[PDB]
Design a protein around this ligand. Structure first.
Ligand code: HEM
Ligand SMILES: NCc1ccc2[nH]ccc2c1
Length: 391
């Protein structure tokens, strides 16, 4: 009936032609392999995410609980969601943020110092994947000793969350990974209870729901939620940022000349190469977009990358342009919108600006070595490698 499928081999290699086709010819597109509709236009994605009652987050509960071990922020609503969301934000704002950022500068310079004498560095594999997990561990309060194993287990859990047809042996490994992370993490939650530090895990322990407190298994689930949420997109976005700047030498120079433009470059990178590509919701009642009827219990999947390149929301949407100013410009959907918008958005922009500015300060006469990237992932998406040389 319809011959263009999200799961075509061509899609993961280059989804942009698919974005353009779907928005123009099938904006609410059914995929029988996973019994879900993919939503490609900016207007409809925005509407879905802004109407949490019609499109709720219970979808993200069977695709999460197996590894998260208890309730995650997305599953919550009402006063509980708002107050716990505020608790998490407390660990990346105020005094917690003032303390964290010097530490993330250290993380960054320690990685740089590991590679500076080789005169090249892989922004994906040498920097991004290491910095991303370490920064998440520092946010939480986890000692960097076992960070290599933390990365391994994180990868296994993330794969279960971001995948669509896992086989039985792949599933069993993702679960093992989450037990090892639980086995590792629960003892530190039990130690943090007594001696209390100034980190996010202690914030969660001091939480007061009137006079109640989240169970340890729920602190673990929320701690795992932050670990997964903060790690995955940081690597990808840093790589995309430097790739796009170097592929547009004139814009790279504008940033070098006015470093303030770096914030805009990060935002444009998040729009152009959205590292979180899909956001699922469950339909709570009969509903219709364009011609396409949806029923209660159906699953819709917002295509963030498609929406962020919608010509109805941006002029020249498929061009990287750090100087976009609000013929047509909209707020991008890379952090979502509405009730469940990313709690880490402001911290992410601050952390990414710090790292980019330090890389630009210490690596002189940067030159691209990976002339053509190859990207992988349809749920979370980024380059396999992104190597740069420097003096
Ligand atoms: C460039 C970096 C990041 C991007 C692109 C990103 C993207 C997103 C998106 C698109 C959502 C919405 C998911 C939905 O509506 O179902 C989300 C939610 C969330 N993100 Fe991020 N995120 C990033 C960094 C972070 C960081 C650093 C944290 C730190 C803890 C974090 C924690 C969360 C949490 C807890 C949620 C759930 C929000 C809620 O349910 O109210 N993320 N993120
Ligand atoms: N907070 C960003 C984010 C959103 C969805 C995700 N699915 C797996 C990891 C992950 C991270």
């Amino acid at each position: 009936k319809v011959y263009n499928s999200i799961f075509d081999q061509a899609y993961e290699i280059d989804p942009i032609p698919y974005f353009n086709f779907l928005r123009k010819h099938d904006p609410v597109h059914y995929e029988e392999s996973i019994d879900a509709y993919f939503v490609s236009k900016y207007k409809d994605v925005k509407y879905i995410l802004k109407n949490n009652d019609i499109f709720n987050t219970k979808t993200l509960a069977k695709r999460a609980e197996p590894v998260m071990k208890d309730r995650v922020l997305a599953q919550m609503s009402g006063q509980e969601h708002k107050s716990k969301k505020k608790a998490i934000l407390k660990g990346m704002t105020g005094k917690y943020l003032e303390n964290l950022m010097p530490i993330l500068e250290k993380r960054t310079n320690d990685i740089i110092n590991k590679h500076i004498e080789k005169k090249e560095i892989d922004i994906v594999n040498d920097f991004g994947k290491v910095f991303a997990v370490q920064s998440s561990m520092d946010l939480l309060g986890i000692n960097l000793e076992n960070y290599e194993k933390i990365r391994e287990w994180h990868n296994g859990i993330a794969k279960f969350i971001t995948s669509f047809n896992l086989n039985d042996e792949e599933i069993k490994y993702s679960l093992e990974c989450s037990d090892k992370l639980e086995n590792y993490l629960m003892p530190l939650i039990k130690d943090r209870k007594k001696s209390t530090k100034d980190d996010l895990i202690s914030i969660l322990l001091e939480y007061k729901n009137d006079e109640n407190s989240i169970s340890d298994t729920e602190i673990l689930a929320l701690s795992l939620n932050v670990l997964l949420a903060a790690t995955e997109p940081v690597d990808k976005t840093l790589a995309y940022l430097f790739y796009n700047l170097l592929k547009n030498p004139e814009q790279f120079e504008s940033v070098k000349n006015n470093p303030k433009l770096i914030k805009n470059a990060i935002i444009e990178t998040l729009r152009y190469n959205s590292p979180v590509q899909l956001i699922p919701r469950q339909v709570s009642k009969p509903f219709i977009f364009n011609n396409t009827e949806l029923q209660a219990g159906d699953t819709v999947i917002c295509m963030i990358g498609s929406a962020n390149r919608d010509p109805e929301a941006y002029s020249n949407p498929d061009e990287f342009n750090i100087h976009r100013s609000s013929t047509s410009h909209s707020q991008n959907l890379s952090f979502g919108t509405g009730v469940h918008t990313c709690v880490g958005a402001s911290f992410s922009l601050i952390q990414l600006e710090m790292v980019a500015i330090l890389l630009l300060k210490r690596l002189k006469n940067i030159k691209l070595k990976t002339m053509e990237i190859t990207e992988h992932g349809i749920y979370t998406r980024g380059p396999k490698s992104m190597v740069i040389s420097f003096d």
